[PDB]
Scaffold this active site. Structure first.
Site, mmCIF file in Angstrom:
data_model
loop_
_atom_site.group_PDB
_atom_site.id
_atom_site.type_symbol
_atom_site.label_atom_id
_atom_site.label_comp_id
_atom_site.label_asym_id
_atom_site.label_seq_id
_atom_site.Cartn_x
_atom_site.Cartn_y
_atom_site.Cartn_z
ATOM 1 C CG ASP A 39 -9.207 5.321 2.543
ATOM 2 O OD1 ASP A 39 -8.599 5.727 3.574
ATOM 3 O OD2 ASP A 39 -8.617 4.833 1.542
ATOM 4 C CG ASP A 91 -1.642 1.264 1.551
ATOM 5 O OD1 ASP A 91 -1.648 2.158 0.673
ATOM 6 O OD2 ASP A 91 -2.241 1.374 2.632
ATOM 7 C CD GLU A 144 -4.996 3.954 -2.289
ATOM 8 O OE1 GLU A 144 -5.836 4.722 -1.772
ATOM 9 O OE2 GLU A 144 -3.903 4.347 -2.751
ATOM 10 C CE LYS A 167 -1.699 7.439 -3.219
ATOM 11 N NZ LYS A 167 -2.058 6.310 -2.323
HETATM 12 MG MG LIG Z 1 -4.668 4.729 2.291
#
Ligand SMILES: [Mg+2]
Ligand SMILES: Nc1ncnc2c1nc(Br)n2[C@@H]1O[C@H](CO)[C@@H](O)[C@H]1O
Length: 390
Positions: free
Chosen positions: A201, A12, A177, A73
């Site tokens: 999330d 991840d 994800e 990211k």
């Molecule tokens: Mg995450």
């Protein structure tokens, strides 16, 4: 005959923290790094003598803010002119430069000014995750599944593969994800018929809601929604402002201009915030916080809940929006999955469970580990090479 094959890993590659797992002996092992941490900061620091990655980089950030890179990211696969990039640059202490309308991070490193593409910084994080896995397995690792947000476009996905290739990894697949979190719970192994799954999330800096449909193990992303300005750091900020006011009332002193005192306060607030997820109150004890004054105080979970009440409630707006976009009613959702450390907050859990009329939340896999867990399950499947029997 045929030599035993190395295990493949699931990574991840997170905005703030990264996590690595391996599926062996019918189960996933989330691999702790050499400081005993099951998640590793997605940080890279540069000095005159070293390049530090993970906990070593994050632990020296206070005195080296210009040469400690985080949040790559947010830059990966994006153009320098992209409005998301331009706004984010105002919050970062490190330099972001324009190279042919592609952002690069510029630092001082080993006596020189050096610029790196976001994929190069991400490859440094991936090299650390590969080494964490090899320290546990006791052999070199080659194959990996890497996850990305469901909203990532082709350029963002290709730049993530490029980061994996620079790190010396063979990228088996780039997976979403929310799909990885669903795989972690075996939600693609429930047989024939359609299942609607909502992934909730809540990260350090952003909030994402995804609705997926799963039919005979096939995943379809039905809707994505969220809030780019909602995360764990906002709850930390509310506690910081509360304790700054408290010090003002109690000692008639404004600490807000001593960066060290504010940072020591914030560090303590984030730990108090974590304690409040398991306890109904938490102590705050800082020695010589400002002008040699010791700051020994407490906060109840009820006061913390009141301080962040509006922020917690605002997580339900993207849930309702995602449900409208998916053209589904809340009762039609079969499974609710929690992702991100901030989902451990009891009040966040209660608000979401109340919204779905008392339904159980899947939170048995540590929410900060579920994405890597699912990525490790998929990596073991992708390397299988069984030949059919007659
Ligand atoms: Mg995450
Ligand atoms: N037990 C926990 N209760 C509340 N919050 C938590 C917990 N564990 C983690 Br991890 N967090 C927060 O998750 C985010 C991950 O980037 C950060 O804001 C962490 O503070």
């Amino acid at each position: 005959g045929s030599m035993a094959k190395a295990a493949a890993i699931g990574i991840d590659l997170g905005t703030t923290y990264s996590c690595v797992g391996v599926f062996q002996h019918g189960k996933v092992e989330i691999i702790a790094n050499d400081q005993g941490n099951r998640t590793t900061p997605s940080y890279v620091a540069f000095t005159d003598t070293e390049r530090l990655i993970g906990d070593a980089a994050k632990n020296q950030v206070a005195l080296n803010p210009q040469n400690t890179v985080f949040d790559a990211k947010r830059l990966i696969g994006r153009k320098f002119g992209d409005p998301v990039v331009q706004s984010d640059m105002k919050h970062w202490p490190f330099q972001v430069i324009n190279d042919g309308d592609k952002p690069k991070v510029q630092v001082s490193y080993k006596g020189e000014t050096k610029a790196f593409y976001p994929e190069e910084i991400s490859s440094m994080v991936l090299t650390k995750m590969k080494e964490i896995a090899e320290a546990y397995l006791g052999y070199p690792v080659t194959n990996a599944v890497i996850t990305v947000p469901a909203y990532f476009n082709d350029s963002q996905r290709q730049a993530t593969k490029d980061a994996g290739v620079i790190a010396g990894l063979n990228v088996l697949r780039i997976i979403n994800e929310p799909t990885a979190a669903a795989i972690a719970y075996g939600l693609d192994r429930t047989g024939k018929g359609e299942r609607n799954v909502l992934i909730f999330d809540l990260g350090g800096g952003t909030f994402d809601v995804s609705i997926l449909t799963i039919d005979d193990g096939i995943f379809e992303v039905k809707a994505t929604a969220g809030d780019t300005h909602l995360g764990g750091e906002d709850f930390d900020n509310r506690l910081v402002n509360h304790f700054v006011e408290e010090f003002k009332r109690k000692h008639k002193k404004d600490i807000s201009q001593n960066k060290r005192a504010v940072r020591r306060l914030r560090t303590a607030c984030e730990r108090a915030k974590r304690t409040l997820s398991s306890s109904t109150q938490a102590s705050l004890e800082i020695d010589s916080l400002f002008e040699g004054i010791d700051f020994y105080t407490s906060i109840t979970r009820a006061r913390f809940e009141e301080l962040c009440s509006d922020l917690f409630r605002s997580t339900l707006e993207p849930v309702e929006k995602a449900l409208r976009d998916a053209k589904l009613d809340k009762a039609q959702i079969h499974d609710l999955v929690l992702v991100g450390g901030s989902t451990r907050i009891p009040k966040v859990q209660k608000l979401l469970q109340d919204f779905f009329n008392g339904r159980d939340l899947n939170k048995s896999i540590n929410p900060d580990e579920a994405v890597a867990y699912g990525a490790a399950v998929q990596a073991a499947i992708l390397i299988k090479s069984t030949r059919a029997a007659a």
